[PDB]
Amino acid sequence: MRRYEVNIVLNPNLDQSQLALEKEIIQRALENYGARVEKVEELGLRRLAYPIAKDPQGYFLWYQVEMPEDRVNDLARELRIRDNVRRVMVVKSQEPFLANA
Structure with a gap:
């Protein structure tokens, strides 16, 4: 139970x-991550x-989410598997x- 930030870099x-299509697809991905x-x-x-x-x-996108730390690798695994995604940073x-003190 906690929140994390997603860092994905797309071409x-x-x-x-x-x-414009990304805005429609990226919005559904938030849900893909459950x-x-x-x-x-x-x-x-x-x-x-x-x-x-x-x-x-x-x-670079930054969003606050509410998902378990164990399912992160599972949903992250899909992002890196996509064609437009280059890497997944959790x-x-x-x-x-x-x-500095």
Whole structure:
């Protein structure tokens, strides 16, 4: 019983029309995970143009869910098996950590 954040990077090569279909498919995937979304965060990554200098292009979604930690590998396993998905990152939702004191 707890909440986790999902980090998935999909090939941002689809056009605008195709990108619209993702919003309809991505919404159903939340349900595929049998998890409920408590909040929706938009990363809006910045795709780099010909010249490269800013951050790397990609799409990172962050949502608060309510699912067991054991079924995470099962639902995560499906995400990595998809064609548009490149990898699956599952992290625990807790306080940040850094050495600076």
